[PDB]
Design a protein around this nucleic acid. Structure first.
Lengths: 127, 151, 206, 100, 79, 114, 99
RNA sequence: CGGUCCGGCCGGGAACUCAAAGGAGACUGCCAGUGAUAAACUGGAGGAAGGUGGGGAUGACGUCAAGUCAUCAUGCCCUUACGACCAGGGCUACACACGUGCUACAAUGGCGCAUACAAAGAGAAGCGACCUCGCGAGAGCAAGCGGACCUCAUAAAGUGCGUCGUAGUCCGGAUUGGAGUCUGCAACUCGACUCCAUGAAGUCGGAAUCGCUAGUAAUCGUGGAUCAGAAUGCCACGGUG
């Protein structure tokens, strides 16, 4: 049966459904290679089911909204970790030690008044 | 850090080779947050710097780093009213950081066509113990040997 | 340093709005201007009625005004003729039919607006400012206020160089948002210019 | 603002309601239509015989309380200073200090 | 750079020009309409265009048609 | 080779080589190569002389050469002799199109002089 | 047919009270109620200079939150229609009735 | 799960994303060690989060006779004028000096074609789709939308292929000529934008000096206020990092 997990990052939210047994990954009706042309984005998605030996042992059906390439890849990684813990729950320690169960709460800092950016302050002249 | 003791951030391994050294090299070579642009450069340079020698890639990169890695550097000091230069021993992490930064600034100061070619040539020169990165390492070691009296 | 307005910082936390209607962008400015004109007329007409707060809310196609006053019999008058006259012109100002309610301020010595008005009236009567300030502080503190501070500024007693003086009793935690701080100001128009009076009244937390 | 500036704004609003509501809309319609009388519609000359203050582009948004011509806000019809004064007194519904 | 739906000219200046050409050679035309376009029927007349303080005499030639009147009356003094 | 526009274009991609003519930019170069029938990515070498005669026949349709310089000089001279505002701005080497002269007029004013 | 009610307010407690009143009016009338569905909040924002002269770096940021609720009744008995068309709700709540 | 024009589109489903109201959660709470058996500090477990988790609002008594009498209010002078109305001009000048920015000097790039992934907003004298005409700015016609519905609105860096091959260049775009569009009574002084043409300086910047400690700097687009029109400024938003 399906084991579900929700992953999130900067602005992305991935819905990950895992099923027992094959090497298939479908992100938004696209393959992993089709969806992520960046190799870091594929390495991040495949990352959690490498500590746990799953080559063709789990089928992933993923949809993801918002964010960019890296945010969506991190959201998919988070969702896959959550679905794997829902699937076994003994993999908790490994995915903890790897750092995948942690939700990366690093959001874009807002622009502040009098500053050119979140922290970038305008050029200061003394004399 | 007046009082701040600070930890370490998680650098991800290289997608192609799985090395933290190569990840930090890509980070140092990256500009304007263009990591995909820097990774292509590093991968092309490592490929071109692979057929030349014969020791795969990672090995060639480490061989190039071994010749640019500085053992001792000078730290400016203002005690006796003038420029004191105390030669301090460099830590291994700072050793690798300095080596990589020097290799990148030496490759960017080249006349070859693309940054991949400049990197490949700089790394091949470093493996041959020549170039401007090895030149800077010998400069630093020279400046340390000159001020050895101030250790 | 400059301090935040203690009333505006607590709006929605522990302080309610004085205008409680809803409107889109089309009618927002019109309702704001009409509320301003209504409040201006009511403050000018009821100057001697100890009016402390004018709450204005606009139901579907009308306006109803609640006047918080410590002298309700003066606002209402014999057979409500005065409040009827007030309503008949509030309806003209607002354009829509009007309704007026009178809410009593049971303890005027604990309302910052009424205290500031009393102090400015005394200042205009050439009363010594220190005496007025201390009388206000004592009257508020003996009536169960948790704290009060009043502050007057600008040519006190006819001085050529302006000065700011403030008296404080009890506890006035302006940084606690949970704190019920009643704050209002007033200006005394004297022969030597304007004297601004500010009053903070602390009535407990939550 | 001076009293004459507010009187000017009032007169301009009145003139813009009187003429440009219908007459100048008609004239500009005759001027912009390509299908009509490409030679002597005469609308261009008649548009300038109307008063200038009747043009809505000559109106300047001023604070409804002070008449300030800068820092205006169409949502409230007030300048920034009077907007802040009314906001802190709790006289603008729903408006409060923002943080995020 | 005005649209191609016809050039602009102030009506009072237009009637002044017609009255000047129909009545034969006349005095310089005093006008403040620096924004009016020079039309071919103004060739030969000298229009005194206001520049802020004075009315600068401008003798119109065939080469000026299409310009605005204010293009021949500088408003700023610089030496 | 050489064109009816005396000028001699370099031996490189035809679309960019035709730009060397005064009066022919990128758009007009593409239009010339399209109306002639020559590809844009072919060099000036590898072009037959019959194909260069074709390019000349097409560039003859444009006023692009010392002729164009003459028409530009005539317009600026007309402006200056007319004495209009733009004529005066051309006479004094000051910006003509409303740019500020308090600062930043260095293209028209040239290197600054104390 | 069916009636949907769009409620707008600046205070969320007030709009929740109004929505509760509406759903009680409808359910106690014997109609079916779909909702109340919390629609997204439109929060306008304003940044004004707090100084009378210069001091641009000194500003206050204000905002107005508009809360939205949607109430649907699928089969509106005449009872329900003329019951809700005479409901008494708070002043600071804007009610729309779409048919 | 059925149907399907393969479009959540239509039956439906209420799971999930999300919307927005209520609640839980973090307290040095637990473990070990150090410490005056104190306060605390160091590490560990667990946990989404760990030590005021990140950011914001919040600015004590006072200092600078600091800024504002030109937002406003307020205690000498003018009054057939220092008040009021109008048209035109100026605030846009230009030998020069400074502050703050934008664009560059390029190959980690320019151009061409193809294609992927946002968030936050605004809209009725308003946003304006589809279609037709125009090289384009735009125009004509005319839906929908007071809006999780409609429109603004195609995100761009990125990625794939091709080309350019280190040159004042297929870098750079200043300046100027011609032809136009739109707003507006009216684009001369003195608007923005489009097309064609032209193609300054600039090849990384002396003395000196600035910002920034993590989703930060750097870089890439997006929106809003003011506003008929006029953003390289301001205020906000997300992407890579």
């Amino acid at each position: 049966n399906q084991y579900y997990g929700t992953g999130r990052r900067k602005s992305s939210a991935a819905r990950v459904f895992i099923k027992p047994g094959n090497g298939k990954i479908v992100i938004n009706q696209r393959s992993l290679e089709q969806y992520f042309g960046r190799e870091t984005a594929r390495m991040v998605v495949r990352q959690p089911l490498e500590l746990v030996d799953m080559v063709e042992k789990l089928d992933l059906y993923i949809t993801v909204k918002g964010g960019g390439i890296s945010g969506q890849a991190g959201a998919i990684r988070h969702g896959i970790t959550r679905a794997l813990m829902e699937y076994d729950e003994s993999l908790r320690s490994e995915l903890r030690k790897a750092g995948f169960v942690t939700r990366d709460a690093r959001q874009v800092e807002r622009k502040k008044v009098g500053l050119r950016k979140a922290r970038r302050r305008p050029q200061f002249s003394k004399r | 850090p007046r009082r701040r003791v600070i930890g370490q951030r998680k650098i991800l391994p290289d997608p192609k080779f799985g090395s933290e050294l190569l990840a930090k090299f890509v980070n140092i070579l990256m500009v304007d947050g263009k990591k995909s642009t820097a990774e292509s450069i590093v991968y092309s340079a490592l490929e071109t710097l692979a057929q030349r020698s014969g020791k795969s890639e990672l090995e060639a990169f480490e061989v190039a780093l071994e010749n640019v890695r500085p053992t001792v550097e000078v730290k400016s000091r203002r005690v006796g009213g003038s420029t004191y230069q105390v030669p301090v021993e460099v830590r291994p992490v700072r050793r690798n950081a300095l080596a990589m930064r020097w290799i990148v600034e030496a490759a960017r100061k080249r006349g070859d066509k693309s940054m991949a070619l400049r990197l490949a040539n700089e790394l091949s020169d470093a493996a041959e113990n020549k170039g401007t990165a090895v030149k800077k390492r010998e400069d630093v070691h020279r400046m340390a040997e000159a001020n050895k009296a101030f250790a | 340093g400059q301090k935040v307005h203690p009333n505006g910082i607590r709006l929605g936390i522990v302080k309610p709005w004085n205008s409680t209607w809803f409107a889109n962008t089309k009618e927002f400015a019109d309702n704001l201007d009409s509320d301003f004109k209504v409040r201006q007329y009511l403050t000018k007409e009821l100057a001697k009625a100890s009016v402390s707060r004018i709450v204005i809310e606009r139901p579907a196609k009308s306006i109803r005004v609640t006047i918080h006053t410590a002298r309700p019999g003066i606002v209402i008058g014999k057979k409500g003729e005065d409040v009827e006259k007030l309503r008949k012109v509030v309806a003209d100002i607002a354009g829509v039919p009007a309704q007026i309610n009178i809410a009593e301020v049971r303890k005027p010595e604990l309302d910052a607006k009424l205290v500031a008005d009393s102090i400015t009236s005394q200042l205009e009567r050439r009363v010594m400012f220190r005496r007025a300030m201390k009388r206000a502080v004592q009257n508020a503190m003996r009536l169960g206020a948790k704290g009060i501070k009043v502050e007057v500024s600008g040519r006190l007693g006819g001085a050529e160089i302006a000065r700011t003086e403030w008296y404080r009793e009890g506890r006035v935690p302006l940084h606690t948002l949970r704190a019920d701080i009643d704050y209002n100001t007033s200006e005394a128009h004297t022969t030597y210019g304007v004297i601004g009076v500010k009053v903070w009244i602390f009535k407990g937390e939550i | 603002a001076k009293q004459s500036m507010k009187a000017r704004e009032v007169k301009r609003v009145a003139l813009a309601d009187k003429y440009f509501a219908k007459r100048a809309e008609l004239k500009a319609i005759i001027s912009d239509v390509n299908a009509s009388d490409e030679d002597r519609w005469n609308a261009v000359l008649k548009l300038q015989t109307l008063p200038r203050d009747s043009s809505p582009s000559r109106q300047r948004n001023r604070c409804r309380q002070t008449g300030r011509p800068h820092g205006f806000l169409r949502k409230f019809g007030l300048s920034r200073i009077k907007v802040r004064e009314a906001a802190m007194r709790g006289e603008i519904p729903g408006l409060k200090k923002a943080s995020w | 750079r005005s649209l191609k739906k016809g050039p602009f000219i102030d009506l009072h200046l237009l009637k002044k020009v017609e009255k000047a050409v129909e009545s034969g050679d006349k005095k310089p035309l005093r006008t403040w309409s620096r924004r009016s376009t020079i039309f071919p029927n103004m060739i030969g007349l000298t229009i005194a265009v206001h520049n802020g303080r004075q009315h600068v005499p401008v003798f119109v030639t065939d080469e000026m048609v299409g310009h605005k009147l204010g293009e021949f009356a500088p408003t700023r003094t610089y030496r | 080779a050489r064109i009816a526009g005396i000028n001699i274009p370099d031996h490189k991609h035809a679309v960019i080589a035709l730009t060397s003519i005064y009066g022919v930019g990128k758009t007009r170069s593409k239009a010339i190569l399209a109306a002639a029938g020559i590809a844009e990515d072919v060099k000036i070498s590898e072009l037959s002389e019959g194909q260069i005669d074709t390019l000349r026949d097409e560039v003859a349709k444009f006023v692009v050469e010392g002729d164009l310089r003459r028409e530009i000089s005539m317009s600026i001279k007309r402006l200056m002799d007319l004495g209009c505002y733009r004529g005066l701005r051309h006479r004094r080497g000051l910006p003509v199109r409303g740019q500020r002269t308090k600062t930043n007029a260095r293209t028209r004013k040239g290197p600054r002089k104390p | 047919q069916r009636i949907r009610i769009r409620l707008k307010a600046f205070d969320h407690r007030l709009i929740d009270q109004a929505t509760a009143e509406i759903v009680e009016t409808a359910k106690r009338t014997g109609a079916q109620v779909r909702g109340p569905i919390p629609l997204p909040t439109r929060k306008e924002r304003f940044t004004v200079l707090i100084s009378p002269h210069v001091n641009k770096d000194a500003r206050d940021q204000y905002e107005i939150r508009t809360h939205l609720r949607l109430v649907d009744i699928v089969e509106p008995t005449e009872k329900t229609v003329d019951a809700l068309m005479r409901l008494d709700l708070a002043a600071g709540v804007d009610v729309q009735i779409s048919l």
